[PDB]
Nucleic acid binder design. Sequence first.
RNA 1: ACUCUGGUUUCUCUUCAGAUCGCAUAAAUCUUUCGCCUUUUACUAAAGAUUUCCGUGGAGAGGAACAACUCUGAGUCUU
Lengths: 836, 57, 456, 194, 22, 195, 49
Amino acid sequence: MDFLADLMDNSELIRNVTLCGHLHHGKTCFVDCLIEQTHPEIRKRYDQDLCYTDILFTEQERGVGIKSTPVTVVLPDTKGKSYLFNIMDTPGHVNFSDEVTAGLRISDGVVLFIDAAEGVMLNTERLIKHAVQERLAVTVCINKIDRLILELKLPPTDAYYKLRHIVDEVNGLISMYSTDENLILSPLLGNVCFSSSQYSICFTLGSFAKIYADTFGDINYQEFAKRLWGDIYFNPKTRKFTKKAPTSSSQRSFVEFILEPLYKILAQVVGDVDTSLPRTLDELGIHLTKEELKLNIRPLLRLVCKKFFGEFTGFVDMCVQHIPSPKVGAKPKIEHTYTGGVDSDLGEAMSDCDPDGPLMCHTTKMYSTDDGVQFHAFGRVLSGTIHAGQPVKVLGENYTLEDEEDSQICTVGRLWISVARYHIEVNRVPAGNWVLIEGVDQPIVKTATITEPRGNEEAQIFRPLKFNTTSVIKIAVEPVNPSELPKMLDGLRKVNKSYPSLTTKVEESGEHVILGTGELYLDCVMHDLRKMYSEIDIKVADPVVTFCETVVETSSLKCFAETPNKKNKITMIAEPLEKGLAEDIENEVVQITWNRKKLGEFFQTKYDWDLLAARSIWAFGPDATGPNILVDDTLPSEVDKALLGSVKDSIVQGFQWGTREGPLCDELIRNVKFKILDAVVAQEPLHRGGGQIIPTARRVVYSAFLMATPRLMEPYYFVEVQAPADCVSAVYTVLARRRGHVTQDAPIPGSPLYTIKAFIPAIDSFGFETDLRTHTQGQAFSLSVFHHWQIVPGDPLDKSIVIRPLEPQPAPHLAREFMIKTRRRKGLSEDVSISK
Amino acid sequence: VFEWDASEDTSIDYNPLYKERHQVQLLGRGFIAGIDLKQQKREQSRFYGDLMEKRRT
Amino acid sequence: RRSRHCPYLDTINRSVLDFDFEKLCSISLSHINAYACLVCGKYFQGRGLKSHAYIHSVQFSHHVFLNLHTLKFYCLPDNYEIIDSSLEDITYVLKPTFTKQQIANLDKQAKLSRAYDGTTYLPGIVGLNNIKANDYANAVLQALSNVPPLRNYFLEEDNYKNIKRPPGDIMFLLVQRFGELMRKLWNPRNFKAHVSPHEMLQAVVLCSKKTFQITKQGDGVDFLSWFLNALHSALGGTKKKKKTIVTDVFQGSMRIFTKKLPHPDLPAEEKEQLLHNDEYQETMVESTFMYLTLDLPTAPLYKDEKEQLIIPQVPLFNILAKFNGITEKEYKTYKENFLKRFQLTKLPPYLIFCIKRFTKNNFFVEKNPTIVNFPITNVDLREYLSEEVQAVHKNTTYDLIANIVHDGKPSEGSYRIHVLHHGTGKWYELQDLQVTDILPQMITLSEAYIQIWKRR
Amino acid sequence: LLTDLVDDNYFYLFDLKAFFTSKALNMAIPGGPKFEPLVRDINLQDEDWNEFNDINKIIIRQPIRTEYKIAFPYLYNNLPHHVHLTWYHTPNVVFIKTEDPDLPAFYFDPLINPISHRHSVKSQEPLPDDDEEFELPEFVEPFLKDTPLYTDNTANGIALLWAPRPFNLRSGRTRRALDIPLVKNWYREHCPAG
Amino acid sequence: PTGEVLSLVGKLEGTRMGDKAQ
Amino acid sequence: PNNENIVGYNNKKCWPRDARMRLMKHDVNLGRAVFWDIKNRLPRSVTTVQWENSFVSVYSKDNPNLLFNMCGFECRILPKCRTSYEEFTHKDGVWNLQNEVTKERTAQCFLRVDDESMQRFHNRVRQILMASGSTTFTKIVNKWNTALIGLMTYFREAVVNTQELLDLLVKCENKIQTRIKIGLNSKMPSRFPPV
Amino acid sequence: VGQLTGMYRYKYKLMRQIRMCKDLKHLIYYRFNTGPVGKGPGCGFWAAG
RNA sequence: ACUCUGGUUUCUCUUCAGAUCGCAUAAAUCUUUCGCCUUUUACUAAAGAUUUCCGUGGAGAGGAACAACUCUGAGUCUU
Ligand SMILES: O=P(O)(O)O[C@H]1[C@@H](OP(=O)(O)O)[C@@H](OP(=O)(O)O)[C@@H](OP(=O)(O)O)[C@@H](OP(=O)(O)O)[C@H]1OP(=O)(O)O
């Protein structure tokens, strides 16, 4: 037990890896198998899964992973060295993608679980893309291999074909996102690992070759494995591995030596327990007692596979050989994550992962105890050692080297290492580990950087947790008894801490809206709020999605606004942005941190813009990565440039505020290009102050946006459904009812199930999963993820339309409804006032 | 009341999607309990049968 | 560096500043870096670019803000600090820091404190705002705030700070919020003549595990006892100190002579032999009491023959006839009767009496309306101490300091409180926002519930 | 007598958890049974027209059905007292049982979509040159060469894997004939159409 | 013909109140 | 601050949701303000007006119906200008309110029997029945007839919209008939005639 | 049983069984008499009742 | 490749039952709402509390079976 703590001293014998994959791909089962291997006293029941690493009531009852769970455990290697592994058991549901990222940011490596029968599916593609964004090491585990044997009964040649197709698809997808070709994946390379987590099968080519060696002896398992995949064949006449089949009907080496023994060992346990099982069991050296042979097929198969494949050394050596240790893998983590960069002295100190260096931890997880009134931080120690009962200085998401307000001095009490449900308390934690921290819940909100006080005062924070999806679902939440409103308010804070991507916002009318990614996400959020945090009755409004605001035509005339001093006059125009350019800003293709030459070169070359106009670009939209552009257009022949630069910043904040809250839908102006066509700046500094210019900038932005014919963008979800062939026609009709257009319908290779990918409006996507599941009797299952904002049918500025209450209006009316009711939800006016 | 009133029916649906439930083919090889196999064979849409005969070489 | 030149000090309006509210952002509901807009009094996310304070400043043209956690003023649209002496009154309203000399002088203070609105008031005796019909908690807190040693201990933050607390402890939140609320009560420069205890009520609900709820009107006696025990438990190190402030202010030593009683339906010889069997003999037990429970005698239940329908009145000495060897009290426990007779041992410096009302009968709960007649000027308690412990004691004279009265039926009642001002000697009765001067003559003319006495 | 159901995904909203939810929420699945309200709440059933549930503020595109509320008990309904969370989607257990005995146990049935192995990119991976250095000992053999791939009992056992509860146990205990509902799974499925 | 009094809710709405009276 | 004014707001539950008062925050606040203004005028000792035993109903942009109650009549006024798609006549519980100048159907008045009146009628029938151990059948029938004519003449045009009152009336009539039949013989007739 | 015996006359809760048994009949017949076999008194699956 | 290992079945009894006692399912009583209502006896249907009944597992004890070696394993078991 003490060796578990002592192993944290060595920064190379620790691997920080996150287990990610699609929904129900054996990740939790794999962690359960690892726990059973390392914990003698923990055993799953014969029919019910172990359900270890899932501690929430919702996790067990729903059966879907909710909260990423930390597992620290010591596992022997293939050679026999006990390494230390920290695992993020992450939810596979796309709606909880944020829960992956919080564990993904502090993870050196990624283990991608893919179901053998299912295929890649959607969340796996999104996961590999996003992990490529953090440039993490990538390993692939095709779990549930037994489903190719015990379910589809595919011939071993076809099983190899399916596995090779899946591996090639994963490699192509990675090559489509990652420029570095070093991320190629192959079982011979130690990247691809095969497994069936239900029966405790976990082997790579090296592990199986080592099994062969221990069976016979004097065998180089490494070189044997390096010839155990692909179009290689084996000749028993010469005992030699060739690139061509020695005979005509010969089988490939992978089939001959790996898939074939697995097929037979499964078949002799599923079909011939009483007839032929003892012979093949004595053949392989597996000795089962008379009682052990009396178990049912599944527990007996799990037991025999546990006895045969032994330890899970394939996973261990995969992670050791392909996932860098924190000591060596810290440098890319600092390069991509830290705001100050590796160039600074702190960057150099934290790149070395020095246990004796300056204290620095990065907390990205919050865990609720039984009471729920005191959260526990969870994060990676990137430098130094944190000690129990020690003063620390916690920074915030908005903290900079100037603003010291966001920090706070907190005493850290007892701290522990979380092994799923049970955590081991430790006096201190060296660098590179994953640690639970107590006593820092109050100043920590979502992402947090913790450092030591009275030293390293030039310490910045890590970049805020970036999420793959844009949370568009919005539900208003109110208390049943307003006399108990504060409690619910308190509960809100708790959920805002617990769920990384949860956004709780109080609107003007007093409605506390909550932003969620999908139906299940908000369902679990409100279950936690009612049953665990608030413990009081709550009320939900009808779900509704957010809306963005855009323009489709050039502003008819230049719109002007003036300061209350009547001396600064700003006149602007409104135009839409180019296709993909908004997506380019969204994906950080081009950033405001770029020097003017690079951004100008991008704009003029790729998008055919004028060089002067490209140099005339001032700022981006609602945030630094906002999809709106603010561009100077004052001609130098009439307007001074240096004088304009004094109020350029104030106009920038004004435009950012205007894009944040749109005049039409009260928020989120998207895909709009604004050009300042006239600037009259008062010659004295006191007549051009920010408090004077920023409201004027907001007013002129509103006038320019409203003068041009506006449009409402509703979020379109990209929904792919995996369903049998007979249900495809029904899915077509169900998608047609909810105003969704079908894009693709591809039968899954190596499986009789089609996959239909379509786009459905998010506002019309509520209950779509339940509708499709119940309409096809559970055969068709769907997952929804945000894809792209699209123009809603209708004109938001056509007042001749009358909105019939409690009736689904036709498409030409929708936009009007979609804004008017939205205004009623904000407490705002009935109609947008063009004058204001 | 020996029998049961028709008003007690719960499967009253205004939605055609729930009025017409997509029957499960059970991979073209499963059969619902009770019903004779011949009637289900001559009743099933045989979409899977058509797919099999198209993929039968 | 353009501080001391803010042209927006005129926009500040101290009338709309209610700092009793919890310091959370009006939009994000966040506790970090609370900033209040002095124009409107609503809190915001904090000072920074593209923050709620910035949005409010650029929207409503409010230019002055105050950092709740820092006690410093800033301008958001221009984003610069403010260093003025004229704003110090707002700082003292938000964070009343009491020096030792002023803390001591509160006993001798006799000046009518004037509020911003012009409603001149007195320190300590400040109207408490009821929220959801829970005036019992307000009355109990007002009574507790009148104790001089407790006032000295809780007025200064560092007096009860710098102690070790359990990592999972939430009781310290209540004990540290009581100090904040009470130093708001004793602050002589309040913007408004009253003090809102809503945050204190919320903390009480949070720490009491859903009892003493804001909605329910709980018993004053139970709330007072729980509050005293909780305050004693919170203070000190990780292990309880023998003598906390509550212990040295209210706790006293008292002696119980418990004698088991045989079944009354037993033969005389059998009763005598059971008494001789050493099981039904007197046993002495010492204990510590935070307060003394006064059992009101039985109501007449019948009209007086001469002057019909007279409210019963009992001298204080008949109630005080308890706690001595001469008088017993046959406790009729459902299992068997007990012959318990009490005896005081060591009187506390401050004494708390709780007159037992709201006694549950066999079918419901009824309130005893018997009135107790007591000398408000002084009482003598030397006669209710055993001869062994009367040598140590030298000051047994007690004068009434606080009085609690319950008006109405137990189902729906009002908790009024009279408090004695040390500086002037006047008695002030305060009920919710209402505050009135009451003559000491008719103090005893009410259903006294909790009495706080000082040994001087 | 046995329903040929492979997995429980058929009983998505038609299982014990969904019926408990329906009983608790005073509503019923179309195919599900109708219960009396768990608590009367006659006056509380129809609340007043507040500003929170203002029908003017509510955007309607598709009606919120009973199935939606039962599937998400804490999202589409108010005050879910004593409600049970239905089990979510289990992996689609696609298991094609054999139909003709004269057929190998492992066989690419036409139901499975053809892989149709493409070679747009010639599969290239780091593997040493052919037949140049590595030669295994003659005594090293595949683990199970003497054993045949599949006996006549392999297909039957594989079918027995995905079988109802009584018919997926090698051994078991003995139950009274009273305690064996032969049509319990008959009414636990949806009523046939027509 | 049972002899019990039936509730006329949802009944005889084709008749006013001033009818059958002069 | 917590918008608690909507909790203690009495509403005429006897009407459907749309017909019932819509508890908008501005309208709830206005009703509370009006009640407080009226309560301020009356001294607290000479008399008292308690909020829970009161009904404040405001017609505004949000509320299309004015709800009031007097003389045992629950009445609701719906102006024809805003939310009157049909000014029908067949419904006899409708008072076609007519302006004295325009002489048009500006408003529609829906009537209902108050719940207190229904409770009083049920109590009267209950005390008629329970005080019939030693009482002639004719006396019971005369008491029932008197109660029925009083209710129907007082609440005419208000019965038709109160279906609960129709159910209560037929239930009480069946109660009277059952009491008489039990008086005749101690066994329920199977096919008793109404003659 | 209700038609043959009528034992519900002395304990009406027993009707709960009868309404169940009849239901089981409707559960069985429309499964029993589905294919070429027409409606008739030929079923003998008496285990449920 | 060895010496000792000592059975399993069945009939009972006595306690404990955690666990779907039971991959099944009853009734009664009581207490709340109810539906009928007119008196008990049947009841309507939900919640709550016990209880009895058809069963069950384990442990321990006492028999018979009935044999009996062994099974099996402690190990040196050996080429
Ligand atoms: O509903 P039940 O009272 O149980 O009666 C049914 C039903 O009769 P009804 O629904 O018309 O009353 C059918 O009998 P039919 O009158 O419809 O022929 C049924 O048999 P099918 O559904 O196959 O027609 C069966 O009849 P049986 O058990 O004689 O086959 C049985 O009728 P009984 O209860 O009168 O037997």
